[PDB]
Design a protein around this ligand. Structure first.
Ligand SMILES: [Mg+2]
Ligand SMILES: [Mg+2]
Lengths: 130, 130
């Protein structure tokens, strides 16, 4: 099963591709992108590039400029082999920059503008552990 | 070509189906629905029911929680033989009451609570003037 956990953003989107076979997780790819222009074309292209079995997203809120993107993805993959799972922020508390720092920290510690890739990565891990 | 102009709503979604052959428009159906529960399920079921070639919707306004339905539809019909057009409100200006009232009135004359079906009706007609 191929997991595509993405950290939704307009100009700063990012997603990490994992492979989960036999309780053995493996980082297949990591990529930054740009959905500031022609988001619809790029959103489908980027998320279908690796044919994920599961796409993980973070809850956005109707007042967010990212909300349109989360609902497009749900509709696009609705009734297909890919299942879209939406979660809550991996990190919560302190200030905005506080969560963005421990996210990047946790990220580089696990490998062995980074906050977008860090988030996407950490989001997949938080999901996989379930 | 089958055109499905929809008047998005949670409890009062309505949509009219127009056939358009030889520069001759004709009513095929007019339906009220309910998207209070499992809107994803009902939205897809209702809009594909009459196999439209085009879906016409109207902008829901900045930071509107019902925009989720608009993007879900764009994403669902993305890259299929179904075009999704989003138009601006058909009746603008004045009070909400007058806009609904002008829709119902206008809808009653051309046809030869009713604001949802009329709104959806007038939306299709407006799109056709294109
Ligand atoms: Mg980000
Ligand atoms: Mg209505």
């Amino acid at each position: 099963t191929i997991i595509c956990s993405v950290d939704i953003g307009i100009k700063n989107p990012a997603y990490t591709i994992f492979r989960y076979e036999d309780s053995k997780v493996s980082l297949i790819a990591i990529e930054k992108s740009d959905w500031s222009d022609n988001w619809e074309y790029n959103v489908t292209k980027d998320l279908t590039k690796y044919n994920p079995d599961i796409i993980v997203l973070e809850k956005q809120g109707y007042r967010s400029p990212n909300a349109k993107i989360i609902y497009f993805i749900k509709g696009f993959f609705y009734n297909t082999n890919t299942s879209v799972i939406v979660r809550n922020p991996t990190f919560q508390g302190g200030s905005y920059s506080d969560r963005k720092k421990q996210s990047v920290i946790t990220f580089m510690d696990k490998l062995s503008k980074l906050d977008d890739i860090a988030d996407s990565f950490n989001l997949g891990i938080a999901y996989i552990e379930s």
